[PDB]
Design a protein around this nucleic acid. Structure first.
Length: 111
RNA sequence: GUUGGGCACUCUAAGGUGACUGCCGGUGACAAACCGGAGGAAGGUGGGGAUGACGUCAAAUCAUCAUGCCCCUUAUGACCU
């Protein structure tokens, strides 16, 4: 429910997400990465500019390499990132036929 | 500890050790790096000091000191109260 601004530093009208009327992106696919004694799945697409906090109870295989879908169990909060889990361990990200299989789960195609 | 009590511990102070990308994951030219993880007292330029290049102001100092040219030289020297 983006609101207008009474300014514009360009040719475009300035929106501002004063509120989110609806949540979409229910789930993301990505590579899981171990950080500072933690986990963080990086979304397949770069359109999500943040990572997804993985707690250990939602690691479920995902190591440095493994591709996994995330049933996002929480979402960003001001400065904080989205939390999640690990769904399907698609396989090591650098595998021939993951490129397809990654897209198979990205789009939410049948199986 | 006051005393007996090796002296352990703390300390005292000489000599060594120790830290680096050395290591293990990512990431990335397989390298470098970057990002984390170990282990360690110490994490990625360990921390404080010390130690620089050519220069300028005819900068300041003839009251630190010395000093050419002067000046004083029974006094501009010197002594006391």
């Amino acid at each position: 429910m983006v609101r207008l601004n009474s300014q514009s530093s360009g040719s475009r009208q300035e929106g501002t997400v004063i509120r989110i009327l609806e949540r979409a992106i229910q789930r993301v696919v990505g590579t899981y990465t171990e950080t500072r004694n933690f986990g963080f799945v990086i979304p397949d697409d770069k359109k999500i500019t943040s990572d997804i906090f993985i707690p250990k109870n939602g690691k479920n295989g995902a190591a440095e390499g493994h591709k996994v879908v995330v049933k996002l169990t929480s979402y960003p909060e001001g400065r904080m990132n989205a939390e999640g889990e690990v769904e399907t361990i698609l396989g090591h990200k650098n595998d021939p036929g993951i490129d397809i299989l990654s897209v198979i789960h990205k789009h939410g195609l049948p199986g």
